[PDB]
Enzyme design. Sequence first.
Site, PDB file in Angstrom:
ATOM      1  N   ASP A  50      30.709  13.427  20.230  1.00  0.00           N
ATOM      2  CA  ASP A  50      32.266  14.419  19.985  1.00  0.00           C
ATOM      3  C   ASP A  50      32.322  15.659  21.224  1.00  0.00           C
ATOM      4  OD1 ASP A  50      35.621  15.244  19.435  1.00  0.00           O
ATOM      5  OD2 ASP A  50      33.981  15.901  17.674  1.00  0.00           O
TER       6      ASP A  50
ATOM      7  N   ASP B 173      35.595  18.437  20.463  1.00  0.00           N
ATOM      8  CA  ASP B 173      35.708  19.851  20.235  1.00  0.00           C
ATOM      9  C   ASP B 173      35.333  19.823  18.433  1.00  0.00           C
ATOM     10  OD1 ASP B 173      37.810  20.638  21.718  1.00  0.00           O
ATOM     11  OD2 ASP B 173      38.659  18.273  21.702  1.00  0.00           O
TER      12      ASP B 173
HETATM   13  C1  LIG Z   1      51.392  23.482  23.211  1.00  0.00           C
HETATM   14  O1  LIG Z   1      50.548  23.231  22.312  1.00  0.00           O
HETATM   15  C2  LIG Z   1      51.074  21.589  22.034  1.00  0.00           C
HETATM   16  C3  LIG Z   1      49.568  21.074  22.078  1.00  0.00           C
HETATM   17  C4  LIG Z   1      49.341  19.652  22.856  1.00  0.00           C
HETATM   18  O2  LIG Z   1      48.791  19.399  22.846  1.00  0.00           O
HETATM   19  C5  LIG Z   1      47.620  19.722  23.589  1.00  0.00           C
HETATM   20  C6  LIG Z   1      47.457  19.072  24.366  1.00  0.00           C
HETATM   21  C7  LIG Z   1      46.519  19.608  26.159  1.00  0.00           C
HETATM   22  N1  LIG Z   1      45.459  20.142  25.130  1.00  0.00           N
HETATM   23  C8  LIG Z   1      45.004  20.593  24.299  1.00  0.00           C
HETATM   24  C9  LIG Z   1      43.894  21.139  24.207  1.00  0.00           C
HETATM   25  S1  LIG Z   1      43.345  21.051  22.200  1.00  0.00           S
HETATM   26  O3  LIG Z   1      42.625  21.910  22.220  1.00  0.00           O
HETATM   27  C10 LIG Z   1      42.663  19.788  21.745  1.00  0.00           C
HETATM   28  N2  LIG Z   1      42.021  19.752  20.399  1.00  0.00           N
HETATM   29  C11 LIG Z   1      42.706  18.468  20.075  1.00  0.00           C
HETATM   30  C12 LIG Z   1      42.144  18.291  18.498  1.00  0.00           C
HETATM   31  C13 LIG Z   1      42.821  17.444  17.714  1.00  0.00           C
HETATM   32  C14 LIG Z   1      44.611  16.925  18.792  1.00  0.00           C
HETATM   33  C15 LIG Z   1      44.823  18.106  19.547  1.00  0.00           C
HETATM   34  C16 LIG Z   1      43.824  18.647  20.348  1.00  0.00           C
HETATM   35  N3  LIG Z   1      43.876  19.536  21.555  1.00  0.00           N
HETATM   36  C17 LIG Z   1      46.446  20.174  23.316  1.00  0.00           C
HETATM   37  C18 LIG Z   1      45.873  20.579  22.294  1.00  0.00           C
HETATM   38 MG   LIG Z   2      35.318  17.066  16.763  1.00  0.00          MG
END
Ligand SMILES: COCCCOc1ccnc(C[S@@](=O)c2nc3ccccc3[nH]2)c1C
Ligand SMILES: [Mg+2]
Length: 180
Positions: free
Chosen positions: A20, A22
């Site tokens: 994993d 994150d």
């Molecule tokens: C402006 O916020 C809308 C978020 C759209 O989702 C995105 C798109 C691109 N990058 C990220 C970075 S990351 O922190 C992240 N970790 C996650 C774990 C579970 C679900 C979504 C997640 N997203 C995210 C969360």
């Molecule tokens: Mg995780």
Amino acid sequence: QYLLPEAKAQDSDKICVVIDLDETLVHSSFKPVNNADFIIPVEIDGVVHQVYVLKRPHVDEFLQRMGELFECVLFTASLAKYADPVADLLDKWGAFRARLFRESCVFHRGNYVKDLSRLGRDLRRVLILDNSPASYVFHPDNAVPVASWFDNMSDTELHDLLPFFEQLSRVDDVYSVLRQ
Ligand SMILES: COCCCOc1ccnc(C[S@@](=O)c2nc3ccccc3[nH]2)c1C
Ligand SMILES: [Mg+2]
């Protein structure tokens, strides 16, 4: 057909570890972080947003050593557009022989499940390392629990987990240690 191609010759004899991203190896955030390990620009509905990525302590030692011991696979619930650049930057050693993302997870009962059976690897030689007990509900006996990491820079779990993977790397059947 399966999530992975056939193992390359370097990799066929080894245990496959699904890793994993994150809260396991890194913690990323949209809120600016002052002394960040890396910053990824991510395009979201046409607008670029900076993502502030912090590396868990000992992650470098951890990944270079697991890249030796195992056929390592990144398997995260995130989107490639964020996780690929993070990987390019973390993975200085070619540890990850494959990368699986959100579309390869099963969405089950509101959780992103990593279904080890779609992997194409004998399950007695598959491990999953994840901070999140839900990603392995289907395979609790393939799992190495790790605590969620956010920013605690005294964390030592990746370092402390290594002698255990050192032992797992050598067995013929992981269930002989984990227990199925
Ligand atoms: C402006 O916020 C809308 C978020 C759209 O989702 C995105 C798109 C691109 N990058 C990220 C970075 S990351 O922190 C992240 N970790 C996650 C774990 C579970 C679900 C979504 C997640 N997203 C995210 C969360
Ligand atoms: Mg995780």
